[PDB]
Amino acid sequence: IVGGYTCGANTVPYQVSLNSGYHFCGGSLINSQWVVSAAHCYKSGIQVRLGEDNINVVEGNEQFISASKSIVHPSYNSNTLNNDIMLIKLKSAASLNSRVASISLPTSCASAGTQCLISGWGNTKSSGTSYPDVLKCLKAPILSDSSCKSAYPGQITSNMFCAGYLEGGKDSCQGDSGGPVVCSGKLQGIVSWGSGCAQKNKPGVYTKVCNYVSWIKQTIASN
Ligand SMILES: [Ca+2]
């Protein structure tokens, strides 16, 4: 996250870290056994880390649970990042408490202008490299589809939305991939892509979760 703030320990209790020997992506806990992330974050051998604030220090609230299965969206296109969504099932159920809690799926798509909370452990610079150890947060509005399509001509599908600041300076970034965009207390987006981070006229692009609710519900009911 570039230009954000320190969330504070366990104020984003649905945020997870995906670990393959190192943190590589975020995700969101949607119930005690399932996490949503980006398909572009797929790898074999994922450990899900819940209740994290400082990813480099054990502070005592964490739960580390291996993934049993990963399910990439059946229409994911790695070239265009269309349908950039994946489900991860945990080998055992998380213990839900005040520090580890699930986030609701949307029944409805969020509106342009809605302020959303984006979080993660990604890069904090638009130029250069500085990774934080503690969870960062950013509030950012959803942009109109026309401003989104203007920013990324020919690249925005109906399964994507833009959120951020056209002036630049504030954005998600590498390492935040997979993480939540929460608006009005529901998971509305997944950190997906953008051109650089925090660049002028290049806002963040997010998977539009409301288009996937039927697939998520069907998949969890059968796996
Ligand atoms: Ca920790």
Curated annotation (Swiss-Prot):
Main location: secreted
One Gene Ontology MF term: serine-type endopeptidase activity
Essential cofactor(s): Ca(2+)
Localization per Swiss-Prot or TrEMBL: Secreted, Extracellular space
Residues that hold Ca(2+) according to the record: 52, 54, 57, 62
Disulphide-bonded residues: 7-137, 25-41, 109-210, 116-183, 148-162, 173-197
GO cellular component, one term: extracellular space
CDD domains noted in UniProt: Tryp_SPc (cd00190)
Listed Gene3D superfamilies: Trypsin-like serine proteases
Name the UniProt record assigns to this protein: Serine protease 1
Organism: Bos taurus
